[PDB]
Amino acid sequence: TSAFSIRYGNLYYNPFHALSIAFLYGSAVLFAMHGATILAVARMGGEREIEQITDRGTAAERSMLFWRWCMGFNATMESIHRWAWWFAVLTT
Amino acid sequence: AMLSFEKKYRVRGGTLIGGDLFDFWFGPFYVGFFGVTTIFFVTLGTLLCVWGAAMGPTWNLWQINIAPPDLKYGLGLAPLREGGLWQIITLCALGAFGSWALRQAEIARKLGMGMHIPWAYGGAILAYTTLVVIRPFLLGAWGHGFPYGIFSHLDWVSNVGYQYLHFHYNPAHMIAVTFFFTNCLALAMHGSLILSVTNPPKGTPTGTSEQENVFFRDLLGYSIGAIGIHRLGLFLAVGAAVWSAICIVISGPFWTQGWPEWWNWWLNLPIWK
Amino acid sequence: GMTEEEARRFHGYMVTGTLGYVVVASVAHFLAWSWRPWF
Amino acid sequence: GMTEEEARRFHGYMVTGTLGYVVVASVAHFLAWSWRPWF
Amino acid sequence: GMTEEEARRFHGYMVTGTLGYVVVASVAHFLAWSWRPWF
Amino acid sequence: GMTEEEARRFHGYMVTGTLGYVVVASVAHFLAWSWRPWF
Amino acid sequence: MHRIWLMYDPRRVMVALVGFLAVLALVIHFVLLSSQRYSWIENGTLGADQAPVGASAPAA
Amino acid sequence: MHRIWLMYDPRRVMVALVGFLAVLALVIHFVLLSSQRYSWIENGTLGADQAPVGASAPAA
Amino acid sequence: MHRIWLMYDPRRVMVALVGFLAVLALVIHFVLLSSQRYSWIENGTLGADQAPVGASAPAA
Amino acid sequence: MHRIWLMYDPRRVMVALVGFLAVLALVIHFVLLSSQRYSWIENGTLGADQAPVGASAPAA
Amino acid sequence: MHRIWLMYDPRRVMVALVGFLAVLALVIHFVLLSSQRYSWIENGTLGADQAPVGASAPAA
Amino acid sequence: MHRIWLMYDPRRVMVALVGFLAVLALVIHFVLLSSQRYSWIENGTLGADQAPVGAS
Amino acid sequence: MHRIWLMYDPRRVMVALVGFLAVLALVIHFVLLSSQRYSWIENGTLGADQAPVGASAPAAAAEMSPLPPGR
Amino acid sequence: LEYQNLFTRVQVRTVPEPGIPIDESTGTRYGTGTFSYLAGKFGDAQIGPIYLGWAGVLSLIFGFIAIEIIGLNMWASVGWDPVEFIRQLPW
Amino acid sequence: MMEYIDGAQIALYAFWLFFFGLIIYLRREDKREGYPLESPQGPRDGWPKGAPKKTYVHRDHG
Amino acid sequence: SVPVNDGIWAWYGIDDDRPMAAWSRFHATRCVEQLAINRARVGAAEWALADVQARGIVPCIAKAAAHLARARAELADWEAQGHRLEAARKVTPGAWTTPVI
Amino acid sequence: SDVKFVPADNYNGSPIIPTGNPMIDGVGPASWAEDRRDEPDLTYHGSHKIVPMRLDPTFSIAKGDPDPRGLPVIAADKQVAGTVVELWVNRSEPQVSYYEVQLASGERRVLLPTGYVQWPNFGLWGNDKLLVKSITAAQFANVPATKRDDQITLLEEDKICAYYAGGHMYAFAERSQPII
Ligand SMILES: CCCCCCCCCCCCCC(=O)OC[C@H](COP(=O)(O)OCC(O)COP(=O)(O)OC[C@@H](COC(=O)CCCCCCCCCCCCC)OC(=O)CCCCCCCCCCCCC)OC(=O)CCCCCCCCCCCCC
Ligand SMILES: CCCCCCCCCCCCCC(=O)OC[C@H](COP(=O)(O)OCC(O)COP(=O)(O)OC[C@@H](COC(=O)CCCCCCCCCCCCC)OC(=O)CCCCCCCCCCCCC)OC(=O)CCCCCCCCCCCCC
Ligand SMILES: CC[C@H]1c2cc3[nH]c4c(c3C)C(=O)[C@H](C(=O)OC)c4c3nc(cc4[nH]c(cc(n2)[C@@H]1C)c(C(C)=O)c4C)[C@@H](C)[C@@H]3CCC(=O)OC/C=C(\C)CCC[C@H](C)CCC[C@H](C)CCCC(C)C
Ligand SMILES: CC[C@H]1c2cc3[nH]c4c(c3C)C(=O)[C@H](C(=O)OC)c4c3nc(cc4[nH]c(cc(n2)[C@@H]1C)c(C(C)=O)c4C)[C@@H](C)[C@@H]3CCC(=O)OC/C=C(\C)CCC[C@H](C)CCC[C@H](C)CCCC(C)C
Ligand SMILES: COC(C)(C)C/C=C/C(C)=C/C=C/C(C=O)=C/C=C/C(C)=C/C=C/C=C(C)/C=C/C=C(\C)CC/C=C(C)/C=C/C=C(\C)C(=O)O
Ligand SMILES: COC(C)(C)C/C=C/C(C)=C/C=C/C(C=O)=C/C=C/C(C)=C/C=C/C=C(C)/C=C/C=C(\C)CC/C=C(C)/C=C/C=C(\C)C(=O)O
Ligand SMILES: COC(C)(C)C/C=C/C(C)=C/C=C/C(C=O)=C/C=C/C(C)=C/C=C/C=C(C)/C=C/C=C(\C)CC/C=C(C)/C=C/C=C(\C)C(=O)O
Ligand SMILES: COC(C)(C)C/C=C/C(C)=C/C=C/C(C=O)=C/C=C/C(C)=C/C=C/C=C(C)/C=C/C=C(\C)CC/C=C(C)/C=C/C=C(\C)C(=O)O
Ligand SMILES: CCCCCCCCCCCCO[C@@H]1O[C@H](CO)[C@@H](O[C@H]2O[C@H](CO)[C@@H](O)[C@H](O)[C@H]2O)[C@H](O)[C@H]1O
Ligand SMILES: CCCCCCCCCCCCO[C@@H]1O[C@H](CO)[C@@H](O[C@H]2O[C@H](CO)[C@@H](O)[C@H](O)[C@H]2O)[C@H](O)[C@H]1O
Ligand SMILES: CCCCCCCCCCCCO[C@@H]1O[C@H](CO)[C@@H](O[C@H]2O[C@H](CO)[C@@H](O)[C@H](O)[C@H]2O)[C@H](O)[C@H]1O
Ligand SMILES: [Fe+3]
């Protein structure tokens, strides 16, 4: 792995390597954010995500509002799992 | 504008500092006292970054490079054009990230949520603080921090790694990498499973926790369950950042030789010396 | 959704606007060719 | 939504603003051209 | 929202303030030009 | 909520404290200036 | 032909079309601007016979 | 043949067809643009006798 | 053509148009400011005969 | 013309406008301050005959 | 002009103002302190005849 | 003039003000402390004519 | 100060005490075992006058330097 | 001090362990469910039966032989010395 | 014979067009709940406009 | 494994649930706590049996009866400890004035 | 007068203020999804997902864990609220979803979600009382009732969970105020 980057003149400047890193880091960002979010509302059944997707409870509403009020936009209880899926898939 | 269900949640209270004084929204955003300090540090830091670009050789986004001072300045503030600007921007960064975590705590308290998100973010702040505060302090000069520039900081990462000849052999780095890779695998499985029960093939009924549990158990042999996978994802993602902080703080302050020769202890265990 | 008479009224604007755009682009190539032919 | 008389009214301002903008851009280009031609 | 009478009143302040700002900026360019012309 | 006479009482303290601080800081600058002037 | 606008919503198609033409035009302009022959911002004032031309087949 | 439009929704097929054609055209154009023989932006004016040709000799 | 404002809400179209024009104007100015010939903040006072020109094809 | 404020809340337009003008002014000042000719903090006391000018095209 | 305080909550316009002035003041002081001509902390006691002036290269 | 305390509860201002001034005083001291002319911990005894001047 | 035994479960205080003494003992032993002067497993039989002492001042030669020249 | 949901103090167990619901052909479930107390404290407790089918069985045979070739070449490279096979394994 | 344009650059803009397409799609999916927004000026959709709220078919009995 | 009530401290030999015939203040404290809990646990178990008998669901009645019997057995185990500590409390001089059971 | 809250003032981003008791009216952190479906959650086989353990004979406590039944519940004011008398279990993913608490100060039994219970010493030892930081012992008397005692609807789950969630802001007046 190290010698491959040496031979081809430093893989840090490969822009698809840089993209892959951004998605590798983003996968850690998202699972930290989403893991923490669901545990913060698990007192209200937020971990029952399929039920929250089919029958939105206050646990889903509060996790949407946390991120909206924090960073100005939010996902849904379903679509957060699409963000997760794509960030992982785009890494490789 | 507000979500269709949002208005009843927009109560007063839950602040840590300031009380009612800043307890209001601006568009979607909650403000609060730490919102005010967030915007202050973000603005001051960002404009000093633009000033760093202006006095540097190019406006090309990829090439802008605000570098720390020479090591000779030790723990003092250097002249601003000689790396003192990087030091002022670093204080703004620490203020902005700390204000962000405390604002997250105020938001979570207002919603009756647990404090998991602020503390999970603390893992990332710990890694940043290790890179620019703790490790440079243990080495005795702020010039050991990384430069602020989209590609010049990758040059720093390259050179720091080769300061230890073969940084892959760093044992904490191997653990940190394993957490990062395992996290990305686990995130792909969790995303896939929830989507595949909630979006089954056309004409199939919506899936259930039981189907998710059965499938997962054929993948790993055991059921993780609903709260378990979110505990795992949090453990993996935050552990990755914590082991990253460990792997860089031991490189220099505690281990100075090449990393391959650290493994000499394994070769000399008495059962096979 | 549109009635067929609405689709028919839209279609004539859409065709005319497309052909109008292609006519303007044809002049742009006439000018570009006069300045620096690519063949 | 709009009533069609409101749509008719708004369009007249929109066309005039687009014209006024294109006129200012046309002067800007001819100033630039006479300062430093690009063909 | 606003009454059309309130829209007229605000428009008066808004146009006047916009033009006042442009007047101050035009003087700032007069001074800047006198000191170091860019063309 | 605070009453206007409470606000007036605090304001007298807050002005006096601020001005006392500024007075002390001015003496500190006088000592610093005497020891090593910066202009 | 018009029944296409029953299969597709013209509100979506027209925004899709505007986005496509925007991207395509920018791609063609930036490809040309990066070339030698058509880097018109630097070399637009050159006459057609003075403008750069790619090298011929090799001759020996 | 028209039973194809009964098996598959034409609305879905048309997007796939246009997607396939757009990608295939872009692939072929940039492959030619990357060649020496057909790099038409730089060398389109050369004329066929002096356009590049790939190396002949199997030997000698 | 005014019924384009019945297809699309003018309040939304104008925000999108203002957004588009702002980004486009900044792009074009930054392209010109990156060039040599139109680096006007440094060389704006040069005469049109003095401004940089990109190189021509070399004579045979 | 005033009916633009029936369409847009003036309270929101003034926020957008002040934000836009603030960033634009900071952009233009930092661009000039990064230039050689208008780095007025270091060189503002030079006369206009003394101020830097970018390179001419050489004559041949 | 006092109608500004009806449109906007004065409690928080005034926080925004004080924040903006504080940021702006700090930016300008750090900019001047970065310069050579106005590094007052180290060169503040120099008279204007001694104070640095930036110039371009003499371009002989 | 006192009515700003009807807008801003003074007990919640004064805690904020103290933090701002504490940070500002620390920043100014450290800027001076590592300048050449004002590094008083190491050159404070010099006297005004001997103190460095940033000429160049 | 025997009222300290009213403040805590005495069984747990003994467990904490034994831990503290054991850990502090091991700290001081391995510190000494790492020193030159008290590396007793290797040099324990040396006489007190023969045992190492840390230098009061190393010498130098003016051209020599322990560190490479820097920037 | 507020309950953090990171650990479960009280697990419950069902005397039967759930099975696979449907489509048992061309392949069958191996084993039967059992409970792990440690896994049940991290997350859910049932270590399950498992599914292979034709593709799973063949995958394991091919993958075993691959790993067997890797390990035997590693072990041959230290001259079949089983102490060096462990001592030097990561090299 | 294009000097500046190369395959790695061509691939990278291909990716950017896909990626900005993907962000749009995800932001449409993110609006299936809670939208349109309430505002004192009436409903607001943001941009892009959200995909419609899904209805979920439950398992018929069990 | 660790016992439920002393948990981590059972690794260090603190184990106050064990059958104790000597007087010991630590075991007496534990026994008073565990008696109150187990009396309440029996009271709950027989309320549960009565409820399930009202519903008439035989396999649930069977289990609720088995649970009640088990809860009674655990209470008897603590009452045995209470009495044997009571016997010791009367004679060991330093012991509590209040009964253990 | 039946609107549960009013704006604190007329400016665009201002908070709302509850008109009544917000824990009971369901405002702020005490609010619940009022539109949520008033039916039980169901298993893959269509049986009620969440039921008292007394009504499913296959369930039991894991051998190493404490049995919560009979333990006292200690509320936010450190008073005893009651004792646990029943467990409710999730039958899709076997776990305890609720304790059922017999109140000491009345005749009610109320549900207590597991996410609101802390064990002494983080459960490392003791394991002999339950700690409920969210609400005071008096506030237990108003915990929302379920229509039946053998099943719980998705709406009742939301109401009960929201009630305890509100106590972290509303149980004592000081909890709403800043720390400094
Ligand atoms: C990572 C990179 C960056 C970060 C990058 C990533 C982040 C990106 C953020 C993107 C922008 C977010 C914008 C937003 O959230 O807006 C919410 C609001 C919601 O609609 P609303 O609810 O109806 O709006 C509120 C309004 O109705 C009532 O406002 P309120 O009463 O609550 O508060 C007052 C305002 C301030 O008041 C004014 O602005 C009016 C002042 C009078 C102007 C008169 C003319 C002067 C002319 C002088 C000429 C000159 C004379 C010479 O806001 C506040 O009070 C905000 C909270 C307090 C302040 C926060 C603390 C700040 C402290 C530090 C100081 C910071 C200094 C910058 O929406 C709107 O108002 C409409 C949209 C506004 C767009 C604003 C951004 C425009 C940026 C343009 C970029 C252009 C690029 C070239
Ligand atoms: C590196 C690989 C991985 C990189 C990974 C990066 C992932 C980034 C994902 C997140 C980006 C989107 C963030 C977002 O959706 O914010 C909500 C906001 C507004 O829509 P809404 O939330 O549905 O509705 C609310 C609004 O309509 C009314 O709200 P209110 O009246 O209360 O407040 C006033 C308005 C004023 O509007 C704004 O200020 C919007 C300004 C947005 C500027 C930033 C765009 C960044 C695009 C990045 C993608 C890419 C752009 C090229 O609303 C607000 O105040 C909303 C404030 C939202 C603040 C969001 C700040 C996000 C900054 C992200 C910077 C990321 C830098 C990487 O949305 C927008 O304004 C439009 C965003 C459209 C999605 C981006 C798609 C870009 C595709 C390519 C261009 C398409 C051209 C047609
Ligand atoms: C701990 C596990 C991972 C993690 C988790 C995590 N990150 C988080 C969170 C969590 C749980 C949040 O809650 C928080 C958030 O709100 O996300 C939306 C956040 C967040 N993670 C972010 C980014 C991020 N996380 C990263 C990493 C990680 N985040 C870890 C791997 C990285 C990496 C590896 O590069 C980045 C870039 C932000 C999107 C957000 C925190 C936002 C924040 O702090 O906002 C306030 C500050 C600003 C908006 C700007 C400050 C500007 C400065 C004043 C000036 C610039 C100085 C800077 C040092 C220059 C750097 C230049 C570079 C080119 C080097
Ligand atoms: C999206 C990108 C991330 C990702 C995704 C990902 N990986 C995946 C998946 C997904 C979504 C799976 O579904 C799949 C999987 O099964 O997950 C559990 C997998 C997988 N990811 C794997 C690993 C892996 N993923 C990695 C990375 C990542 N995976 C990315 C970060 C890495 C890294 C970082 O290097 C590794 C090493 C595997 C655990 C698994 C695929 C398993 C597989 O293919 O196994 C084939 C079988 C063998 C090698 C043989 C094993 C033989 C045993 C010794 C038993 C022998 C028994 C007997 C002797 C023979 C049989 C006898 C017969 C008679 C029965
Ligand atoms: C670098 O070089 C490389 C890249 C390598 C080289 C290769 C390049 C390649 C492969 C290029 C491919 C190009 C291409 C392929 O398809 C290009 C195709 C382009 C197309 C299709 C263009 C179409 C334009 C159509 C337009 C503009 C329509 C406008 C319509 C208007 C204005 C009317 C709107 C409606 C109204 C007003 C009605 C309102 C009233 C109503 C509703 C009422 O009254 O009801
Ligand atoms: C690498 O290539 C590079 C180098 C980049 C080169 C290539 C660049 C390229 C490809 C450029 C393309 C450019 C382009 C393509 O189309 C550009 C197209 C531009 C366009 C369309 C501009 C249109 C502007 C219109 C304006 C300003 C209108 C203003 C209207 C106003 C003010 C009135 C508003 C209404 C009012 C006041 C009434 C309210 C009444 C109401 C409400 C009532 O009555 O109710
Ligand atoms: C490096 O070079 C690069 C940068 C690259 C080159 C490119 C540059 C580019 C592209 C620049 C574009 C610039 C631009 C384009 O248009 C710039 C446009 C600027 C504009 C429009 C400015 C407008 C200013 C308006 C002002 C100040 C209004 C003030 C209003 C006031 C005072 C009154 C408020 C109301 C009051 C007091 C009463 C309320 C009554 C009420 C409520 C009642 O009565 O009810
Ligand atoms: C490197 O160079 C760079 C840094 C770059 C250069 C630039 C620097 C810059 C830009 C600096 C800006 C500085 C600045 C700008 O404004 C600084 C502003 C300073 C200010 C405003 C200070 C104010 C201080 C106020 C004080 C101390 C008040 C004390 C009050 C007291 C004690 C009484 C309180 C009341 C009580 C107790 C009530 C009792 C009775 C009660 C209750 C009853 O009776 O009921
Ligand atoms: C050739 C095959 C290679 C396979 C390599 C496998 C390596 C596996 C190593 C596992 C090491 C686990 O080590 C464990 O890491 C976690 C990471 O969170 C540390 O935990 C740390 O982070 C967590 C957050 O996640 C904090 O809450 C905690 O306070 C802190 O200690 C543990 O203290 C440590 O014991
Ligand atoms: C350089 C520019 C070249 C021309 C650019 C293209 C635009 C030309 C517009 C002016 C010429 C007339 O253009 C013509 O307008 C009429 C209405 O006026 C449109 O007509 C449309 O609406 C009418 C009703 O009003 C319908 O009956 C008709 O079926 C429909 O197509 C035509 O579709 C268009 O062809
Ligand atoms: C007269 C002797 C009688 C028998 C003595 C038996 C001694 C047994 C070993 C004593 C030392 C064990 O080591 C000591 O363990 C205690 C147990 O709480 C630890 O104590 C600490 O950690 C434990 C977990 O590990 C926490 O639960 C506890 O709250 C904290 O105080 C000390 O940090 C450690 O130093
Ligand atoms: Fe999830």
UniProtKB/TrEMBL annotation, chains G, H, I, J, K:
Bacteriochlorophyll a 2 binds at residues 29, 40. Keywords: Antenna complex, Bacteriochlorophyll, Cell membrane, Chlorophyll, Chromophore, Light-harvesting polypeptide, Magnesium, Membrane, Metal-binding, Transmembrane, Transmembrane helix. Bacteriochlorophyll a 1 binds at residues 29, 40. Signal peptide: none annotated. The modification N-formylmethionine is found at residue 1. It is a single-pass type II membrane protein. It is found in: Cell membrane. Coiled coil: none annotated. GO terms for biological process: photosynthesis, light reaction. GO terms for cellular component: organelle inner membrane; plasma membrane; plasma membrane light-harvesting complex. Residues 1-41 form the Antenna complex alpha/beta subunit domain. The chain crosses the membrane at residues 12-32. GO terms for molecular function: bacteriochlorophyll binding; metal ion binding. Antenna complexes are light-harvesting systems, which transfer the excitation energy to the reaction centers. This is Antenna complex alpha/beta subunit domain-containing protein. It comes from Gemmatimonas phototrophica.
From TrEMBL, chain M:
GO terms for cellular component: organelle inner membrane; plasma membrane; plasma membrane light-harvesting complex. It is found in: Cell membrane. It comes from the Bacteria. Bacteriochlorophyll a 2 binds at residues 29, 40. One of its GO terms (molecular function) is bacteriochlorophyll binding. Keywords: Antenna complex, Bacteriochlorophyll, Cell membrane, Chlorophyll, Chromophore, Light-harvesting polypeptide, Magnesium, Membrane, Metal-binding, Transmembrane, Transmembrane helix. InterPro entries: Antenna_a/b (IPR000066), Antenna_alpha (IPR018332), Antenna_alpha_CS (IPR002361), Light-harvesting_complex (IPR035889). The keyword Transmembrane helix applies. This is Antenna complex alpha/beta subunit domain-containing protein. It comes from Gemmatimonas phototrophica.
Automatic annotation (TrEMBL), chain O:
Gene3D superfamilies: Photosynthetic reaction centre, H subunit, N-terminal domain (4.10.540.10). It comes from the Bacteria. The modification N-formylmethionine is found at residue 1. One of its GO terms (biological process) is photosynthesis, light reaction. The keyword Membrane applies. This is Photosynthetic reaction centre H subunit N-terminal domain-containing protein. Residues 34-62 are annotated as: Disordered. InterPro entries: Photo_RC_H_N, Photo_RC_H_N_sf. GO terms for cellular component: plasma membrane light-harvesting complex. The chain crosses the membrane at residues 6-26. Keywords: Membrane, Transmembrane, Transmembrane helix. Residues 2-62 form the Photosynthetic reaction centre H subunit N-terminal domain. It comes from Gemmatimonas phototrophica. Pfam families: PRCH (PF03967). The keyword Transmembrane helix applies.
UniProtKB/TrEMBL annotation, chain P:
It comes from the Bacteria. Residues 61-88 form a coiled coil. Keywords: Coiled coil. This is Uncharacterized protein. It comes from Gemmatimonas phototrophica.
